[PDB]
UniProtKB/Swiss-Prot annotation:
GO terms for molecular function: aryl-aldehyde dehydrogenase (NADP+) activity; ATP binding; long-chain fatty acid-CoA ligase activity; NADP binding; phosphopantetheine binding. It comes from Nocardia iowensis. It is an enzyme of class 1 (oxidoreductase). AMP binds at H296, S391, D412, G413, T417, D491, Y503, V504, D505, R506, K512, K612. Monomer. Signal peptide: none annotated. The conversion of carboxylic acid into aldehyde involves three key steps: adenylation of the bound carboxylic acid substrate to form an AMP-acyl intermediate, formation of a thioester linkage between the acyl moiety and the phosphopantetheine prosthetic group, and reduction of the thioester intermediate to the aldehyde. This is Carboxylic acid reductase. Catalyzes the ATP- and NADPH-dependent reduction of carboxylic acids to the corresponding aldehydes. Catalyzes the reduction of a very wide range of aliphatic carboxylic acids as well as many aryl carboxylic acids. Aryl carboxylic acid substrates include substituted benzoic acids, phenyl-substituted aliphatic acids, heterocyclic carboxylic acids, and polyaromatic ring carboxylic acids. Cannot reduce benzaldehyde to benzyl alcohol. It catalyses: a carboxylate + ATP + NADPH + H(+) = an aldehyde + AMP + diphosphate + NADP(+); an aromatic aldehyde + AMP + diphosphate + NADP(+) = an aromatic carboxylate + ATP + NADPH + H(+).
Length: 635
């Protein structure tokens, strides 16, 4: 059977693979972690002691290369990873915490805010745990946020320390020049031998000097060396009836201004011991590649859930996924969380390889099997026990495809920053943490409890993992809870039967075409991902119009040897074939579109940090062009 075959691979792994064998969670440690009165920092401490000698975290090895022509010295990555142990990481954490707690003039205290501007890394983990160690509130800033937004965040949270990576010092210094509250700027992920990083650092210190700031600019290495000669810091443990704030996770609802979702000491502890499948509540060996930012809930769960199981968390070299598959192939994780964008990258690799190897003497469906086998064992590392997709919808055909590549199920996990990570797993309500739910009719979008095969409406939730609200935004907080205490997800679902729900789309993505047919734009975007010719797609509509438009980023091979006209016909053809396969309505098919050779990225503000389309920014970028296309066509 399919499970039988997969279970045969795992038995081989545990017989043969000694890294895997050595990373099995310890029952005694898991027991201690799930102990009743344990608070967040005690959990961290227990894990670190319990797994002290094991590799905890890894990063790419690197070299420093001097170009004798330019004279410039740059950090260069090597194709391997280096690890540090639980003991070493915790030692580093304790050093930062001692430095902060025992500072002679201006020490940090429980409840102070600390702001962090980074990706995900050993240094990030060090700073984040040190906050936890002292009961400081972590504010992990989104790299994708505009400086104006960052300043808004800092104004609101009044942190006493700001920490930043070199690539982010430009935004960090503008925040500090603006008269915000941090007293120290701590640079991390910092290699002074790299000229570009050194220049960013020395610029940062000299601009703050020139401007007469009293901010102390320093390196994380220097903070650690200082704490190394200071007494041990106390471990923060709130009293039994207290649940102080521990973490703010900023998230942008249906339009991009950040609101800080409040995670209390208790809610943050669920990332170590809550029951998702990627949370630390299991005995699965956790060797994983962390490629999502610590500013997002999925990044934090990926780190803390792995640490909770005594596994090893490897950090991706880059935040834009440009090293993602090289990293996965080197790490060979025993688990992944996919976002759909990553499934896209796998599909594009497949299409490319298949097209390339499809020579005259080929047997094609045996070739398909061979390309997928190569993807599986080599591109993705061949050590997977489990796979999950989440954060955004995956179309049925791409799910079918990915399962064919992985040769195991691809679990669909639905959750949110506000509601919690688990909520729905493969269409099944997860209890715990869900306490109850209901569907509420949405008459103006055509979703009623009395709809056709299955009831439809907005999902409203109660769960143990729901946030209490957003930090200092109580009128915004008021709107996400109904009179009875239900969290309004803003998501449309269908109820197949009790506790079994199918995600449709966000309420705000449901559009009524003029003839009165509703379309779901994010869902249709997912469907057209299966076009072998489409690299990215943004689908756009107007309720004043009868049909959809799109902005399509073609693949490199789709582009090759074609002019604009030919490229459009080829895309249009592919679009029709995909629509047929997914049994789409005629009105669900983009009837024209813009060709865009510039990919949507984090850097140009069109992708989020977890590679989701940022709809408000895409509407602002292409909306005028698109409406003009509507007008030209109507003419
Ligand atoms: N498995 C999934 N399928 C479809 N959409 C999802 C899934 N998981 C999360 N989402 C979407 O992501 C939103 C939460 O985003 P975030 O707070 O960034 O995790 C949800 O309200 C959904 O719109």
């Amino acid at each position: 059977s399919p499970d039988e075959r997969l279970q045969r691979r795992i038995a081989q792994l545990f017989a043969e693979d000694e890294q895997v064998k050595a990373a099995r969670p310890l029952e005694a440690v898991s027991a201690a972690v799930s102990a009743p009165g344990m608070r967040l920092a005690q959990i961290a401490a227990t894990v670190m002691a319990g797994y002290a000698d094991r590799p905890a975290a890894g990063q790419r090895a690197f070299e420093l290369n001097t170009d004798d022509a330019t004279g410039r010295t740059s950090l260069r990555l090597l194709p391997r990873f280096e690890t540090i142990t639980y003991r070493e990481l915790w030692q580093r954490v304790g050093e930062v915490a001692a430095a902060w707690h025992h500072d002679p003039e201006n020490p940090l205290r429980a409840g102070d805010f600390v702001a962090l501007l980074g990706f995900t890394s050993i240094d990030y983990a060090t700073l984040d745990l040190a906050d936890i160690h002292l009961g400081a509130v972590t504010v992990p800033l989104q790299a994708s946020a505009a400086v104006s937004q960052l300043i808004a965040i800092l104004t609101e949270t009044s942190p006493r320390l700001l920490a930043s990576t070199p690539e982010h010092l430009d935004a960090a210094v503008e925040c500090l020049l603006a008269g915000t509250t941090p007293e120290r700027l701590v640079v991390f992920d910092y290699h002074p031998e790299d000229d570009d990083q050194r220049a960013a650092f020395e610029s940062a210190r000299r601009r703050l000097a020139d401007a007469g700031s009293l901010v102390i600019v320093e390196t994380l290495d220097a903070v650690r060396a200082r704490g190394r000669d200071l007494p041990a810091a106390p471990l923060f443990v709130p009293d039994t009836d207290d649940d102080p704030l521990a973490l703010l996770i900023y998230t942008s609802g249906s339009t991009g201004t950040p609101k800080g979702a409040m995670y209390t000491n208790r809610l943050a502890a669920t990332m170590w011991q809550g029951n998702s499948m990627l949370q630390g509540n299991s005995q699965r060996v956790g060797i994983n590649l962390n490629y999502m930012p610590m500013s997002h809930i999925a990044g934090r769960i990926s780190l803390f859930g792995v640490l909770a199981r005594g596994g090893t968390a490897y950090f991706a070299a880059k935040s834009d996924m440009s090293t993602l598959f090289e990293d996965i192939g080197l790490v060979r994780p025993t688990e992944i969380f996919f976002v759909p964008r990553v499934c896209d990258m796998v599909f594009q690799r497949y299409q490319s390889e298949l097209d390339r190897r499809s020579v005259a003497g080929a047997d094609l469906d045996t070739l398909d099997r061979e390309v997928k086998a190569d993807l599986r064992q080599n591109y993705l590392g061949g050590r997977f026990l489990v796979a999950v997709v989440g954060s955004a919808p995956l179309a049925a055909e791409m799910k079918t495809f990915m399962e064919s590549v992985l040769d195991l199920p691809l679990h669909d996990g639905y959750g949110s920053t506000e509601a919690g990570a688990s909520v729905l797993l493969d269409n099944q309500i997860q209890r715990p943490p869900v306490l109850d739910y209901k569907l509420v009719d949405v008459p103006e979008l055509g979703y009623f409890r009395t709809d056709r095969p299955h009831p439809r409406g907005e999902l409203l939730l109660k769960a143990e993992t729901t946030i209490p609200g957003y930090y200092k935004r109580p009128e915004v907080t008021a709107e996400i809870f109904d009179e009875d205490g239900f969290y309004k997800t803003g998501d449309i679902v269908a109820e197949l039967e009790h506790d079994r729900l199918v995600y449709v789309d966000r309420r705000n993505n449901v559009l009524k075409l003029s003839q009165g047919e509703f379309v779901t734009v994010a869902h249709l975007e997912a469907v057209f991902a299966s076009s072998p010719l489409i690299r990215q797609i943004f689908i756009y509509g107007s309720s004043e119009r009868s049909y959809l438009l799109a902005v399509i980023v073609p693949t490199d091979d789709a582009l090759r040897g074609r002019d604009t006209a030919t490229l459009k016909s080829a895309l249009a053809e592919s679009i029709q074939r995909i629509a047929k396969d997914a049994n789409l309505q005629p009105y669900e098919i983009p009837r024209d579109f813009l060709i865009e050779t510039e990919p949507f990225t984090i850097a140009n503000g069109l992708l989020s940090g977890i590679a989701k389309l940022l709809r408000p920014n895409l509407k602002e970028r292409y909306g005028a062009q698109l409406e003009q296309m509507y007008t030209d066509l109507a003419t």
